[PDB]
Structures are given as C-alpha cells and as structure tokens.
Amino acid sequence: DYTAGKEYVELSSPVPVSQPGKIEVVELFWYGCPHCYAFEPTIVPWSEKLPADVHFVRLPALFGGIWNVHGQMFLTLISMGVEHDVHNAVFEAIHKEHKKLATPEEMADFLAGKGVDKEKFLSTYNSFAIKGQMEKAKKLAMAYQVTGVPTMVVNGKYRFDIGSAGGPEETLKLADYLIEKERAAAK
C-alpha cells in the first residue's frame, strides 16, 4: 500500500549492510534526541521480536558536538558488549535525571553505577579502534543522506522516518513491509 517517494524513498546508491546475509534494519539516533527517547517504547519491543534473518542495529548520528560525544559513548558500550544492558538507563539519565553525560569522565562515573568497568570504558572510549568505528558511522550516515533523527534505513536501500511513515506504529509497519520486500527478492 506504501508508495516509493512518499512514505519511504529508495536510495539510488544502495549502501552495504553491516551483516551480509541478513536483512538490515538501522535506526539512526542520538541519545539526547527527545523524539528518539519518545520512540523507544515503540521500537524496543518490536526490535526484540524480529526473525532470525533480520539484523537490527542502532547507529549514532555523528552530526557534531555533543552528538559525537554521545555517539562515541554508544560505540564504546557496543565494543564492550554492554550497550543493550545499559541502553534504557542512558536514555533515562539524559531525559529524566538531567544528566549531561558530556565528557568521558562523567560517562564513566555514571556507567560505573550501572556495573560498567570505568577503566575499560575510558581505555575503550579513547582507543584507536573506536576512532575507526566513529569514522565508519559518519560515512554511513553520509551514504544514507540522513539529515536528522530518528531515521530508519532498511537493507541499505530504503530510508524513512516517523513523519514520512505517518506515525510511530506506521514506521514499524512500513519497516515490516520493506523487510518482506527484501525477503522476497532474488539473491
């Protein structure tokens, strides 16, 4: 029922996916983005129920300043294997508890309260590997031609957001539709 050019657009230059062989679903986000926070109760449970051939990932939008700092925190937590465990807490700290989480010392101190090893967080945050991950995330957002958040990209090919889909539920229904489109495709 959806129409290319209306609720979603097809990227004329499709982008490689992070896990070849799975249908990718990317949510570009920023931890400090209030619409992103408000979307969480919709996208979180949906993301946890996806089938075995779908790979859902969040990608931080590194659009400068505090977005880069918060994005670097995200990527650090992913590298440490703990983002999923502290994800809701980071959103709640920023939006309900008034925590800025604006420097790695502040981040580490907060995250220690949630069980995260502070010395490993700081070493990882400042690591050369994370410099590479930051660059890759930047380049992906450029390739998706994304200019704000939250924005969804399915299989490196289809871009849409809450406004274009027509609401938060509609965004997930559209994602589901596009996932089926890609599952049906020749390979």
Q: What total number of domains does the chain contain?
A: 1
180 φ/ψ angles, rounded to the nearest 5 degrees? -60, -40
For residue 162, give the CATH number of its domain: 3.40.30.10
CB neighbour class for 159 (10 Å; exposed up to 12, middle 13-18, buried from 19): buried
Resolution of the model in angstroms? 1.4
Task: Specify the experimental method.
Answer: X-ray
Note down the domain range covering 19: 1-187
Strands 151-154 and 23-29: antiparallel
- And the tokens for 125? 């945050």
Rounded Cα–Cα distance for residues 140 and 164 (Å): 21
Would the CA dihedral through 10, 11, 16, 18 be positive or negative? negative
Contact 29, 150 (CB under 8 A): yes
